[PDB]
Amino acid sequence: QPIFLNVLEAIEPGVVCAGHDNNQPDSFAALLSSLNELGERQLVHVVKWAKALPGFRNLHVDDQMAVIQYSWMGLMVFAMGWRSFTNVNSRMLYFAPDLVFNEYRMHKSRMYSQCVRMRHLSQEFGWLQITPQEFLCMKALLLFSIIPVDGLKNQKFFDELRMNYIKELDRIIACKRKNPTSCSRRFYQLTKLLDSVQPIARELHQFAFDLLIKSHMVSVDFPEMMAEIISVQVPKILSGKVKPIYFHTQ
Ligand SMILES: COc1c(F)cccc1-c1csc(N2CCOCC2)n1
């Protein structure tokens, strides 16, 4: 029985819609208001998903919310890239069924560069032939990929959990591979892909923060929970107090 993968499939969120009005001309304020609403809705699902992951209760209660909050943007990026690949072969960014970005919308959103980096990530899911099971284990690992310089309340419990998710990824890679060289090559590819999420998430964090600071001038609404993340947690990342764990750092 593949217990670990059984769980990851079982907990995977279903479809989340933004509530956007597609039946009006595009505007920056409406697009970003809808993206923010989608982010709030996604956050509720990400919390419920994370809390149901294998071993998640091993973390100190004081650390559980913090790692979700730090990782939320990257998790959104990685899952949206997958949706975009699977649903539309990377032709568009599939933020939600009712919030699909073509290049016009990427431009209108003022996050064109971030968007095209996400489109490239989408493409990579196909070029690398990422399997659904690789995707699920990678996404879980991505939750455990950002830590504070000053330490979590219980860093050792986090460290052990992270280790265990890397071991699961090793197990998934080795399943149909009959050769430690083939396993190594695949691990290299997958860890490179995971590392590539991080600069995208940082760019999106910078945009989110800048937009929140000017939000009252540009008519863009930020829902409560995601606003709190952007004003409390995100600056800790952007100031370097909280940093990603890069597999391939130098
Ligand atoms: C679910 O929405 C997203 C996704 F699917 C992939 C990447 C980012 C988002 C998202 C939702 S709210 C958001 N930000 C808040 C507004 O500034 C840009 C970053 N990004």
Numbering used by the authors: 670 to 919
Show me the paper's own sentences about this structure:
The androgen receptor (AR) is a ligand-inducible transcription factor belonging to the nuclear receptor (NR) superfamily. The AR has a modular structure composed of an N-terminal domain (NTD), a highly conserved DNA-binding domain (DBD) and a C-terminal ligand-binding domain (LBD). Endogenous androgens—testosterone and 5α-dihydrotestosterone (DHT)—activate the receptor by binding to its androgen binding site (ABS) located in the LBD. All current clinically used AR inhibitors, including enzalutamide (Xtandi), flutamide (Eulexin), bicalutamide (Casodex) and darolutamide (Nubeqa) target the ABS of the receptor.
In order to understand and eliminate this undesired partial agonistic effect, in the current study, we investigated the molecular basis of the interaction between T878A AR-LBD and the most powerful partial agonist compound VPC14368. A crystal structure of T878A-AR-LBD with VPC14368 bound to the ABS, was resolved at 1.2 Å resolution. According to the solved structure, the AR LBD consists of 11 α-helices arranged as a three-layered helical sandwich and four β-strands organized in two short sheets —a well-documented fold in previous structural studies of the AR-LBD. The compound is accommodated in the ABS by a network of hydrophobic and Van der Waals interactions, as well as weak hydrogen bonds. The phenyl ring of VPC14368 establishes hydrophobic and Van der Waals interactions with the surrounding side chains of M743, M788, M750, F765, L708, L705 and with the main chains of V747 and M746 residues. The thiazole ring is stabilized by hydrophobic interactions with the L705, G709 and the side chain of M746 and M743. The morpholine group interacts with the side chains of A878, F877, M743 and M781 through hydrophobic interactions and forms a weak hydrogen bond with the backbone of N706. Another important observation is that highly conserved hydrogen-bond interactions with N707 and Q713 residues, which are maintained in the AR complexes with hydroxyflutamide, R-bicalutamide, and bicyclic-1H-isoindole-1,3(2H)-dione, are, in fact, missing in the AR-VPC14368 complex which likely also accounts for its much lower binding affinity.
